[PDB]
A paper describes a structure:
GmPOPB is the macrocyclase responsible for macrocyclization of amatoxins, eight amino-acid ribosomal peptides with the core sequence IWGIGC(N/D)P. Amatoxins are cyclic peptides further modified by a characteristic sulfoxide cross-link between tryptophan and a cysteine, and hydroxylation (the extent of which vary). GmPOPB is an unusual enzyme catalyzing, depending on substrate length, proteolysis, or macrocyclization using the same catalytic machinery. The protein contains two domains as observed in other POP enzymes.
The same inactive mutant of GmPOPB was used to obtain a complex structure with the 25mer substrate; it comprises core (residues 1–8), linker, and recognition tag. Although we observed residual difference electron density for the N-terminal residues of the 25mer, we were unable to satisfactorily model it. In all 35mer and 25mer complexes, the enzyme adopts the same “closed” conformation in which the lid (the propeller domain) sits on top of the catalytic domain. There are no large differences between the protein backbone positions in the complexes with the 35mer and 25mer substrates (root mean square deviation (rmsd) of 0.48 Å over 720 Cα positions for the S577A structures). The carboxyl terminus sits in a pocket where it makes water-mediated hydrogen bonds to the protein. To our surprise, there are only a few hydrogen bonds between the protein and the tail. Significant differences between the two substrates are observed for the residues of the linker region, since it occupies distinct conformations on the 25mer and 35mer complexes.
Residue numbers in the entry:
A (entry chain A): 6 to 727
B (entry chain D): 9 to 25
Write the structure that this text describes.
């Protein structure tokens, strides 16, 4: 491979004209507009690019060595927290190690298993999603048992599809390799099509469930777009023709919907969302003992877009809600619906400097809360009177989630972090006062010893003076003496927190090469609440990029990493982050760049699939004042001819409907046009398996792709196997 | 945040009933 040998890429004469508040009419050539399309010319181009990328990777014998190490690092048994259904049995997911989809197991006995005996010794298969299609073309993307434990609803996607289909089966009818060989599927004839972008919410009478669906579309009808969502109700044992439309809004075709049902059967809740801002409406209906019927009466409790409201529970007409209303770090309020003018009060007040991330009601009257303080989760138990009783797992450092059912006398915590593979803790209210908290299961990994790795948090300063924390992970033999390479990962938007997580592949890379992993908590994320998001959003989105570039500069200046040896990686918004960072940062700031499925055409993102929802994140290119801050940031529109680019390996999936791949296609074509003689390769990989909505790749392909990515980075930074 | 890069089995039973 050598510079200047990129595929022949036609440049059209297409020009789009935008309105700028400061400059008036702005003509913007789009010579690669044709890469938005699906044609034989595009297929020739993608094939040529993918062949070039693979030819380059074929030169690197270390990639196969990394595949071997990475596959081994993933080859350990994995499991979820178990859930106790109303049949008395416990159900949990189990992966033997390298299965592409984990398998839902049910306890042999109606008692909590001793999991030290082994999953197959204490449980039998209930639902194996790998058998949904013999060829692996179908995946289970979401599931939900009914409250009575009698039924299991499950959403299935297929390769090539843009929606999921919900099926229902009795909990007494397993789906396994044995059951398929021995008889018919076992499911009911119910087939609930066109499901997308909501949860499955059973009514507490177990008669049916709420789900969001879209209009049916014939193959050649319409465009690839999801509009005119409907919140619907499906009664078990019926066809979809009988489903009830609970809510839709023809006046606002872009809005989407969610629902919840109170444990006591009294209330149905409707949430409405207009964009990706964390603002929502909240309406409340009273259900009578007959449950959901047509013609529901909504009380419009929250009827303007101003804040995030999510129901926790209710006691009678007193509804407990997690909200950021006048509280950017979140809090719990009560809204008392027995009043005509609801009374609103703080139950758990906002903490100025810790985000309230999750609250669940447990054992009927208690509350379990997770606070994210300095991007590290803390777990607390609260009484019915709102008294903080105790901190649970006080020495845990990482990310935590709660799993429970309110009526039950236990809850679980799932705990993980950079060196914590996955611990499931149990709190049992029936146990003696000092014996209530225990460890149910700890994930045991393969080859790696998590104790060999350390994570710390350091603080650096961005351009504008803001102090930003950053996690640094290392194998403990690695010194911060200005010699290590660094992989710096980010997302940087949508109030998504860049939380600790366990990755055996990353740890294997760190140990193999003596490298460090860096995760800066840049603005645009949610780590410090709404104000942190607002600090990198719309007109302040540039701050996200400044924060990410400053992190890389800090790693080198302060001797965590060697000059030229910071590589960057991110996906979706994180791919935008990577692509904009390499355009904007001083030459030589980065040694390698891997944007995955990234946004890059910030002038047209709102014209494809669900991109209009991101106007709350990026601004609206059609508004002149907003064009003026978008255009200078858009990576496709800011490539220069005079800056050396780091080695770059862009990766996309051809079927991606979240971020259409034209973003990356235009970006790579623009790079290759502007700096064809760049000294470092500028390459793109294009996976041509068209994943259905919500579907993942097979494990073997994920391992192969990880080896290509991390091997590319290692070679670009000059790292050798030692 | 980590959909493709991290196995999600650990959290997959957090909200199934």
């Amino acid at each position: 491979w050598a510079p200047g040998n990129y595929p022949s890429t036609r440049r059209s004469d297409h020009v789009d004209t935008y309105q700028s508040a400061s400059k008036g009419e702005v003509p913007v050539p789009d010579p690669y507009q044709w890469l938005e399309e699906s044609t034989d010319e595009v297929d020739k181009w993608t094939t040529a690019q993918a062949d070039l990328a693979q030819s380059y990777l074929d030169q690197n014998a270390d990639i196969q060595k990394l595949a071997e190490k990475f596959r081994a690092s993933r080859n350990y048994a994995k499991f979820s927290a178990p859930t106790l259904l109303d049949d008395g049995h416990w159900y949990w997911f189990y992966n033997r190690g390298l299965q592409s989809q984990s398998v839902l197991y049910r306890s042999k006995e109606p008692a909590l298993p001793d999991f030290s005996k082994g999953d197959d010794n204490v449980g039998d298969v209930f639902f194996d999603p790998n058998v949904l299609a013999a060829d692996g073309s179908a995946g289970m993307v979401l599931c939900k048992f009914s409250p009575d434990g009698k039924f299991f609803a499950y959403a299935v996607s297929h390769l090539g599809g843009d929606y999921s289909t919900i099926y229902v089966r009795s909990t007494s009818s397993p789906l396994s390799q044995a059951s398929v060989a021995q008889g018919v599927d076992g499911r009911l004839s119910d087939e609930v099509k066109w499901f997308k972008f909501s949860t499955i919410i059973w009514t507490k009478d177990s008669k049916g469930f709420l789900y969001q669906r879209y209009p049916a579309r014939e193959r050649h009808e319409g465009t690839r777009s999801d509009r005119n969502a409907m919140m619907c109700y499906h009664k078990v044992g019926t066809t979809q023709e009988e489903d009830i439309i609970v809510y839709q809004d023809n006046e606002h075709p872009e809005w989407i919907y969610g629902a919840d049902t109170s444990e006591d059967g009294k209330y149905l809740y409707l949430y409405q969302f207009k964009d990706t801002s964390k603002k929502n409406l909240l309406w409340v209906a009273e259900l009578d003992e007959d449950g959901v019927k047509s013609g529901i009466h909504w009380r419009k409790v929250v009827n303007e877009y101003a804040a995030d409201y999510n129901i926790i529970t209710n006691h009678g007409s007193l509804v407990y809600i997690k909200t950021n209303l006048n509280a950017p770090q979140y809090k719990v309020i009560t809204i008392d619906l027995s009043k005509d003018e609801p009374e609103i009060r703080d139950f758990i007040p906002e903490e100025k400097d810790a985000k309230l991330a999750q609250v669940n009601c447990a054992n009927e009257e208690y509350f379990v809360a997770i606070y994210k303080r300095n991007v590290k989760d803390e777990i607390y138990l609260y009484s019915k009177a709102g008294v903080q009783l105790t901190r649970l797992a006080p020495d845990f450092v990482g990310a935590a989630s709660i799993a429970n059912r309110q009526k039950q006398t236990h809850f679980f915590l799932t705990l993980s972090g950079f060196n914590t593979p996955g611990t499931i803790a149990r709190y049992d209210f029936t146990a003696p006062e000092t014996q209530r908290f225990s460890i149910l299961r700890t994930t045991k990994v393969n080859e790696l010893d998590p104790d060999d790795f350390e994570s710390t948090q350091v603080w650096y300063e961005s351009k504008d003076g803001t102090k930003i924390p950053m996690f640094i992970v290392r194998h403990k033999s690695t010194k911060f003496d200005g010699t290590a390479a660094a992989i710096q990962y980010g997302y940087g938007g949508f109030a998504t927190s860049a939380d600790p997580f366990f990755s055996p592949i990353i740890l294997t890379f760190l140990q193999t090469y003596g490298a460090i992993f860096a995760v800066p908590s840049i603005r645009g994320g949610g780590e410090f609440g709404e104000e942190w998001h607002k600090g990198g959003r719309r007109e302040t989105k540039v701050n996200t990029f400044d924060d990410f570039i400053a992190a890389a500069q800090f790693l080198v200046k302060n001797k965590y990493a060697a000059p030229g040896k910071v590589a960057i990686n991110g996906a979706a918004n994180g791919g935008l982050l990577v692509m904009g960072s390499i355009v904007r940062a001083p030459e030589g700031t980065f040694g390698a760049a891997v944007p995955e499925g990234g946004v890059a055409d910030l002038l047209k993102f709102h014209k494809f699939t669900g991109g209009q929802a991101w106007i709350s994140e990026y601004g609206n290119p059609s508004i002149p004042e907003e064009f003026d801050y978008i255009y200078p940031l858009s990576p496709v529109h800011n490539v220069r001819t005079d800056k050396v680019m780091p080695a770059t390996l862009i990766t996309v999936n051809i079927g991606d409907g979240r971020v259409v791949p034209m973003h990356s296609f235009k970006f790579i074509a623009t790079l290759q046009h502007n700096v064809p003689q760049n000294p470092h390769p500028l390459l793109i990989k294009i996976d041509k398996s068209w994943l259905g909505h919500g579907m993942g790749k097979p494990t073997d392909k994920n391992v192969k792709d990880a080896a290509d990515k991390w091997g590319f980075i290692a070679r670009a930074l000059g790292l050798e196997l030692k | 945040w980590t959909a493709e890069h991290v196995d999600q089995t650990l959290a997959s039973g957090n909200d199934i009933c």
